[PDB]
Structure formats: C-alpha cells, structure tokens
Design a protein around this ligand. Structure first.
Ligand code: NAP
Ligand code: NAP
Ligand code: CL
Ligand code: CL
Ligand code: CL
Ligand code: CL
Ligand code: CL
Lengths: 288, 290
C-alpha cells in the first residue's frame, strides 16, 4: 500500500509499474512520450503529465530509462524536489555512471540505490528472478518490502557502482554455462555410440549435475580469497588430462565450439608454472 | 531392505571407496585387486578379500568393476567368460563410448547382464546421497541392482545403450568447465580495481549461486528449441546477446581480465547474426558448433 513512482514506461518500466500494482502499492507513473500508460491506468495506476508531479507523488521514485544521460535529463531539473526522497535507479549503464549519479544524488540529499534487473520484462513480478541493488543501505532497508514486488532483491553493498559490475560478471557466468551446455548438447546429439540423445534428455541430467557444479564454485571461492588453491582430489593435472579427452571426443563427433582449446591452453599455462596439484581456482591468476 | 552379495574388482582409490560404501550399507562385499596388500582397511570393515579375480567373480551375483582402463577390464574379465554367465556386471571404469559398447557386447555374448557407468564425483564423495552415478545398458540389471547401487550415491539410468554413460560424462564435464570458466571470469571482473570492484570471490559467488537458478531456467527453456529445430528469441535475442557480450568484452579489457571467453562468445553469436538469425534464441547457436 506504499506510494511508489515509476519514471519510464518502456517495456521494462511498464513491467515494473505493473508489478508494483499487482502487489497493491499506490503507483504513480510518468513517461516522456504521452500515451503509454493506458493499460496501467486501467489496473489502478495514476498517470501524471510531468515528471515533477510524479516525483512529488511518492517518497520512493523508481527510474527505468534508456540511458543514464536520460536519467539526468529528467531528474536534474528536479534536484531541489528530490531532497529526502529515495531514488532507485534500475537503468542499465556503466559503473562510473552509477557512481556519478550516486554522487549527484548525495549532493542533493536524495537516498540513492542503483540497481540491475536480472531478467526481461516478462520475468518482473515472478519468483526466483533477481534484482540486484547497491548504494544506500537505509534506502534498501526502507524500501525492500516495496521492491519485493518486482522480484527477489539482493543488497550487494554500499558502493552504488557494484550492481553494474555484477550484471556484467553474472552474464559472463551465464554465457560460460550456456556455451558448455551447447557443447554438451551437440556431443550428446551427435551420431556415434551412446549418442543421438535429445537435448531435453541431456538437460534433465544436466540440471541435477549443476547442483554439484555449484558446490564446486562454493568450494573454490575461498581459495581465490585466500590465494591458496589446494587441489584435493581434482587437481589441475586431472582437469588438463580430462580436457584433452573432451577435445578428442569433440573432434571425433564433429563438435567445434572453441571451448576445449580455451580450456587446455589455460590449464596448460598453470601446469607449466608448476601448479598442477592445485584447484581450478588457481586459474584466476592466469586470466587476471 | 535386505543386504546383497557384491564383488568389487579393483582397489585403487575409487574402487576401495566403492567397496567401503557397499560395506557401510550392510552388503556382503568381496574384494580383489591385482596387486596384493591394498585391502587391509577394508577387511577390518568386514570385506572378504580373495586372491584371484576368479574367486571374486564366483562369490557374488553382482560384480562391480573399477579399474584404471578398459584395457585392464579386458585383461581381468576375458579369462572369466564362462564364470560370468548369469551374473550382473556393473562397469564403473572410465573410458570411451566404443569401449563401453564392445565390453557390453562381449558380456551379452557370454550371458552376463551388463551395465556401464560413470562416477560424477571423486573417491571421498562415494557413499553420499548428493553425488551422481550414471548408468547405461541393461535395464534388468539397473532395476535389480538399484537398491544395492544406492550405497554409492544417487543412481541415474540414462537408457539402454551401454555407451551413453561415457558420452554423458564428457558432456557434463564440458558443461562444468564452461560454468567454472565463466565463474572465474566473473570473479576476476568483480575483484578488479574500479568503481564497484574489489569484491571478494565469496561475495560474488553468494549472488552467483542464486543467479544459477535463472541460468538453469534458460537451459530448460532452450533444450526444446534444439530438439524442435525452432529458436524463438522472444525477449532475449541473439542481437541482445551480442550487444551485451560486447559490453563484457569492453569491461574485461578495461580491468585486464583476459580469459578468451568474450572473444569466443562474440565470434559465435556474430556468425549466427551474419547468417540472419539475430532474432533467434541462444539455442540457435547449436547449429554453429555442430
Ligand atoms: N528490456 C530488458 O530486457 C531489460 C533487462 C534489464 C535491464 N533493462 C534496462 O531497463 C531500461 C529500460 O529498457 P526498456 O525495455 O524500457 O527500453 P529502453 O529503450 O532501454 O528505455 C525506454 C524508456 O526510456 C525513455 N527515454 C529514453 N530517452 C529518454 C530521454 N532522453 N528522456 C526521457 N526519457 C527517455 C523512453 O521514453 P519514451 O517512451 O518517451 O521514448 C522509455 O520510457 C534500460 O536501461 C535497459 O537497459 C532492460
Ligand atoms: N578417482 C577419481 O576421481 C575418479 C572419478 C571418476 C572415475 N574414476 C575412474 O575410476 C577408475 C579407477 O580410478 P582409481 O582412482 O581407482 O585409480 P586408477 O589408477 O585409475 O586405477 C587403479 C586400479 O586399476 C588397477 N589396474 C590397472 N591396470 C590393471 C591391469 N592391467 N590389470 C588389473 N588391474 C589393473 C590397479 O590395480 P593395481 O593396484 O594392481 O595397480 C588399481 O586397482 C578409473 O577408470 C577412473 O577414471 C575415477
Ligand atoms: Cl508511503
Ligand atoms: Cl510523498
Ligand atoms: Cl545436436
Ligand atoms: Cl552368487
Ligand atoms: Cl584403454
């Protein structure tokens, strides 16, 4: 039942407004171009003609525009009106622009939370999908109950630029996974003994296996932070040997992704450096 | 419910772990190893060690094999063709799909029920219900021995073709390495100097492990695309993948993260977009690696 304003009714901003309405919040919306708020008004939103009216309507102002340049074009004329309000900026952009906007919000007495949306418009308001936030802890703690309407909120910490970096790092993790998955699908689907398996059958097993892969990540993160990489029962020597088997199996079955060559070159450099007994986490030193 | 009689051939670190887990579950376990003197601890845990593989095979209706190579499997099993008739052989040696099939065919010629398997953990993970063992081959063997095999870990029946487990192992390891390398790349990006950086690997990984639920949703969404040969892009097209991969490439260069992953990703999506599939899903890329 809290008052919340959304600035920006593009596909994503309209979805945020819709999710706020579905949670029962008193939702005021504004967009630069008229005529994009009729469906939302039918669901109980109040559309207003100016950003100044929209900002004045709610103590919590959620911004979702195309660029950070657009954020300041809209909000800098309203600097005096933002004192004491909370600004949650879900616009995507660079870490430096997040930091510059946080500094600007601080200068004007607005509590500033920068965020990133880890889904597409249709995922907003649904379970499991993440929104990541960084900046004012008071803003996060005071707004979390309302922000929950959009998806699962995570507070990354106090530095407003964190969300931008996390988004890029998490997409890289997603692409590494999805590419290893595509490689596996193509291996399973290929003609050959034990092949001609569908992607759906493979993925049913893969989804179980990903539980084990997640434990590996949880085991290896403290190795990176300690700078100590004990290899235990799965050393880089064994990674490299088995990667060579993957390379050979892939070549036989006609799967050409670049992944095996990337993996063997990287592990090979760490082994040449004498770290063959270490965990996969030692490889962070060979990409950084 | 009722304890079984099982034989393990092979007392290397994995084979000895398998035998220990059968014992822990209450099974009457007979063990043999080519080299004597590796079954000491197992005997005190209740195993019966015998001197020859022939004695070991004759001791149990279920014969679990875990040797260094399929060459070794052949050297041990070939003189025992007659002795295997009517027994179930579960071969957890790692090896090639063709070697699994050839062993399967030999076992069938001699009247043994043959199940080939792969162990998706290391010796210390055996005997825990959270790690996977994948099996393929005789469904009669799997159904009849599943209760016993549960002692080792969670068993999964991949199907009737004995060679499948070998292929799944390699494919799942590739998936693991793609994930772990994307994770390493992300750890490096988060740890680097810069606004929003100097974040610990542990902090990053706390968020990453929540995010992996979403990544799994993508794999479950995209598998039917591959099987149908139809790749609707919907709200995440290859155009958008390519655009955001370029951001990743730029961010990584600025922070000195050099993993080769951004170049692999941009080149692959680039080929599909040049081919005219920019509006399709990530699943369309299967056609550009096979
Ligand atoms: N859609 C996604 O998949 C997704 C996922 C995660 C994050 N995001 C982020 O969410 C934000 C919104 O994306 P989107 O889907 O809504 O489409 P968008 O094209 O990125 O942004 C459209 C919105 O920005 C407004 N805008 C652009 N320039 C403006 C300016 N100079 N002054 C005032 N308003 C301006 C548009 O107003 P008009 O209607 O008047 O043109 C519209 O409301 C982006 O930063 C995007 O990167 C999107
Ligand atoms: N360890 C793991 O992390 C892991 C994970 C998944 C799968 N696996 C698979 O498990 C199997 C065994 O691995 P392991 O850890 O036990 O060590 P291993 O070195 O791969 O195999 C050692 C065992 O093989 C026996 N062996 C080797 N050559 C033989 C021959 N010509 N004739 C008879 N026996 C022979 C050795 O007997 P002796 O003692 O007399 O030399 C010993 O019992 C391998 O196929 C491995 O790939 C292992
Ligand atoms: Cl309120
Ligand atoms: Cl107010
Ligand atoms: Cl395929
Ligand atoms: Cl018997
Ligand atoms: Cl061999």
């Amino acid at each position: 039942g809290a008052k919340v304003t959304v600035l920006g009714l593009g596909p994503m901003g309209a979805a945020l407004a819709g999710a706020f309405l579905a949670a029962g919040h008193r939702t005021t919306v504004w967009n630069r171009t008229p005529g994009k708020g009729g469906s939302l008004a039918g669901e109980g939103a109040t559309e207003v003609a100016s950003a100044a009216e929209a900002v004045a309507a709610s103590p919590l102002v959620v911004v979702c525009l195309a660029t950070y340049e657009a954020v300041h074009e809209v909000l800098d004329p309203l600097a005096d009106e933002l004192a004491g309000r909370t600004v949650v900026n879900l616009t995507s952009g660079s870490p430096v622009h997040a930091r510059e906007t946080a500094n600007w919000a601080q200068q004007h007495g607005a509590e500033y939370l920068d965020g990133v949306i880890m889904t597409t418009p249709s995922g907003i308001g649904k379970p499991d999908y993440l929104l990541l936030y960084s900046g004012s802890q008071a803003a996060f703690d005071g707004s979390r109950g309302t922000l929950c309407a959009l998806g699962e909120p995570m507070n990354l910490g106090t530095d407003a630029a964190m969300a931008s970096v996390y988004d890029t790092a998490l997409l890289g993790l997603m692409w590494g996974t999805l590419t290893g998955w595509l490689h596996g699908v193509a291996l399973m689907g290929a003609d050959g003994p034990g092949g001609n398996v569908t992607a759906t059958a493979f993925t049913e097993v893969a989804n179980r296996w990903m539980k084990t892969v997640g434990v590996f990540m949880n085991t290896y993160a403290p190795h990176v932070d300690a700078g100590h990489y004990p290899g235990d029962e799965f050393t880089l020597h064994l990674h490299h040997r088995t990667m060579n088997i993957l390379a050979h199996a892939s070549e036989l079955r006609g799967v050409v992704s670049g992944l095996p060559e990337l993996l063997t070159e990287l592990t090979g450099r760490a082994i040449t450096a004498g770290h063959g007994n270490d965990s996969y986490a030692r490889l962070v030193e060979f990409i950084r």
